[PDB]
């Protein structure tokens, strides 16, 4: 079964400057700004763009060791990034995949908005405990504010 999740938040960073850092160069930043959450983001197969398979390795002590994601779309113009979690972590018998779309839109006051949609494809008709959803919301908040804090500490970075 498919179970749909949505969440919206804001950042003080402009949409373009945030998309360049939080999405395009997120492989570099996430182990650098939030090492307590992500140890490394290995790019197993691909050219960054669609079809790419990243290996996000986690520090030992977190509930999961790693996950492997697949890049589905990188919209450099409208600031969209749809990717799918396909292996590792919560994925297995009771969950097929987690498809995620992140869009960043600019706000008039110079900031930005993050629309975050989660699409959980459960095998059969199993439920999804909030612990997995709560872990994803906390993970998104942690990485967003870490890159945000990095972009505030270095006003030069990413133009």
């Amino acid at each position: 079964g498919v179970f749909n999740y949505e969440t919206e938040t804001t950042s003080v960073i402009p949409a373009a400057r945030l998309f360049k850092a939080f999405i395009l160069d997120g492989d570099n930043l996430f182990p650098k700004v939030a090492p307590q959450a992500i140890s490394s983001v290995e790019n197993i197969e691909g050219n960054g763009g669609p079809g790419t398979i990243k290996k996000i390795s986690f520090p030992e002590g977190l509930p999961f060791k790693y996950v492997k994601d697949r890049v589905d779309e990188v919209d450099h113009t409208n600031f969209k990034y749809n990717y799918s979690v396909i292996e590792g972590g919560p994925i297995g018998d009771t969950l097929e995949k987690i498809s995620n779309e992140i869009k960043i839109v600019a706000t008039p006051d110079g900031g930005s908005i993050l629309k975050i949609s989660n699409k959980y494809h459960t095998k059969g008709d199993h439920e999804v405990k909030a612990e997995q959803v709560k872990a994803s919301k906390e993970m998104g908040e942690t990485l967003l504010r870490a890159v945000e804090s990095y972009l505030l500490a270095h006003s030069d970075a990413y133009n």
């Epitope: 938040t9 090492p35 307590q36 520090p59 906390e138 908040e141 500490a153």
Partner: antibody, heavy 115, light 108 residues
């Protein structure tokens, strides 16, 4: 950016420590708002830190009895440590942290746990 | 939690000499070490972040280096105003943890 502690300097054992820190000279968005204490026995100790989005992160040795809250409208954040004992007597620093470390600090307020 | 060890506890140097402080971590903190100075009666001030980089306003006479488990802070041309206790901090794994501190006393 400016931070000022305000809270009781004397807390009786098993009661609740409560501290508040006022942010001025800068937006509530800038830092990871942080609580750090310093005691002779334990040295410098990370209590926890809160984003302006509400996401907290607590030290496991103190997560059992520590809650950190933020009120972005009043430009304030708070620390609440209940069931305090003499092992909680320390100078408490409210502070603002970047991703790389604590960038700005409060003056520090001395809390004594005593009967 | 990752346990940071600082060596030595106390060193006593004349002004103008080079001060070399050491920090050791029970596990690998890749490059995520910070150095703070705490002059008496004051809140600590960050000097080195991510083990070699220097925040804006910290003079060039402070530098850090190291990776893995062994890092060192170096103060070129000590001043009498450099009398303080210097702590190292890892941010690799929560909880972030400090070292016991190295006190730099100024010879006179």
């Amino acid at each position: 950016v400016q931070l000022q502690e305000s809270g009781p300097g004397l807390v009786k054992p098993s009661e609740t420590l409560s501290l508040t820190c006022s942010v001025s000279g800068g937006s509530i968005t800038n830092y990871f708002w942080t609580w750090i204490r310093q005691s002779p026995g334990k040295g410098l100790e990370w209590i926890g830190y809160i984003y302006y989005s509400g996401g907290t992160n607590y030290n496991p040795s103190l997560k059992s009895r520590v809650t950190i809250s933020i009120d972005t409208s009043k430009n304030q954040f708070s620390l609440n440590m209940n069931s305090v004992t003499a092992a909680d007597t320390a100078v408490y620093y409210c502070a603002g942290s970047y991703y790389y470390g604590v960038d700005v600090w409060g003056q520090g307020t001395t809390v004594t746990v005593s009967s | 939690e990752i346990v940071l060890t600082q060596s030595p506890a106390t060193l006593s140097l004349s002004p103008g000499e080079r001060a070399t402080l050491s920090c050791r971590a029970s596990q690998s903190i890749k490059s995520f070490l910070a150095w703070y100075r705490q002059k008496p009666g004051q809140a600590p001030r960050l000097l080195i972040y991510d083990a070699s980089n220097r925040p804006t306003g910290i003079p060039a006479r402070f530098s850090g280096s190291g990776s893995g488990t062994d890092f060192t802070l170096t103060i070129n041309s000590l001043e009498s105003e450099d009398f303080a206790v210097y702590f190292c901090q890892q941010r690799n794994n929560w909880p972030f943890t400090f070292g016991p501190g190295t006190k730099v006393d100024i010879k006179r």
